[PDB]
Design a protein around this ligand. Structure first.
Ligand code: MWU
Ligand code: CL
Ligand code: CL
Ligand code: CL
Length: 304
């Protein structure tokens, strides 16, 4: 037998929170949560299913809720609770600067080496934590990392996350070919080491300020390109030191890839001397009613 999952799933009354405005279209809202009987306001993102007249859609969102409730790490998104109105609502920590994909696209000109490499560290810590929790994300991508502040990012989108057991077996869907390990595209094998392949791609997105991997290459062709030994090119800002780490994440032998713990170490060494490891034009010259009882979710802790 495995260790029991004693995560608490918190049920919230719809009256505990206020939708302030729409971020995306079901529909994600920016809002505020007052925990019942506590003098605190918590900035939240409220993910509300549209119809939910789909029994299928409901399993998907509750699986997400299951996983986000069972994770507690500074570099992974946690659930504050769920609301069981007509439409099931996930309440989570608001990540006000949006996805790191949009953030690096929008801010190409203001992002220096210190921020890129620290991001690579934080995503490695997030991902190592999940590995410690025997969790395979299966959808790591710069779009699925959110920005709390420019100094603080979190892995999100646990919709595809599964427990390990090594090779996890899948059986269809709309899948992110350009981020996936070869063994995942060919045999639907997913491991922590398939997650290291997508970490690799995620880092290439950051280091290219959000370029599209294999842009203008049909997904049908990716498996053959990879089998032919082709990989994404060295980004302009990347020293061979940084690119060689990306390349090792894209080895065909899964056990020849680095471990998330090793990636933490290698990126931290690089983060102590960022301008040795990334070369960016103008790097040194770069900067990035009642709110009284507002507390960030990260300072809002309930008994464990
Ligand atoms: C890590 C919590 C989370 O996913 N929050 C979020 C989602 C969408 C927009 C903003 N914040
Ligand atoms: Cl699950
Ligand atoms: Cl560091
Ligand atoms: Cl409490």
């Amino acid at each position: 037998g495995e260790a029991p999952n004693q995560a608490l799933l918190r049920i919230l009354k719809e009256t505990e929170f206020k939708k302030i405005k729409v971020l995306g279209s079901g529909t994600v809202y920016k809002g505020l949560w007052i925990p019942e009987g506590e003098k605190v306001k918590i900035p939240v993102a409220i993910k509300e299913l549209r119809e939910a007249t789909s029994p299928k859609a409901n399993k998907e969102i509750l699986d997400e809720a299951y996983v986000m409730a069972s994770v507690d790490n500074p570099h992974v998104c946690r659930l504050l609770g769920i609301c069981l109105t007509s439409t099931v609502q996930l309440i989570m920590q608001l990540m006000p600067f949006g996805s790191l994909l949009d953030y690096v696209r929008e801010h190409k000109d203001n992002i220096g080496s210190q921020y890129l490499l620290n991001w690579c560290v934080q995503i490695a810590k997030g991902m190592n934590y999940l590995e410690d929790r025997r969790l395979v994300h299966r959808d790591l991508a710069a779009r699925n990392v959110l920005v709390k502040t420019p100094q603080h990012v979190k892995i999100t989108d646990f919709g595809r996350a599964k427990l390990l057991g090594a090779e996890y077996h899948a059986e269809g869907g709309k899948v992110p070919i350009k981020w996936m390990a070869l063994e995942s595209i060919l045999h639907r094998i997913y491991t922590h080491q398939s997650d290291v392949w997508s970490y690799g791609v995620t880092v290439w997105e950051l280091m290219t300020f959000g370029s599209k991997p294999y842009d203008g290459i049909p997904a049908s062709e990716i498996s053959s390109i990879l089998e032919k030994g082709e990989r994404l090119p060295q980004p302009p800002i990347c020293t061979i030191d940084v690119y060689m780490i990306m390349v090792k994440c894209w080895m065909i032998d899964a056990d020849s890839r680095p471990k998330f713990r090793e990636l933490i170490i290698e990126f931290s060494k690089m983060a102590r001397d960022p301008q040795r490891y990334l070369v960016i034009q103008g790097d040194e010259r770069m900067h990035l009613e009642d709110m009284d009882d507002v507390v960030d979710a990260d300072e809002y802790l309930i008994p464990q």
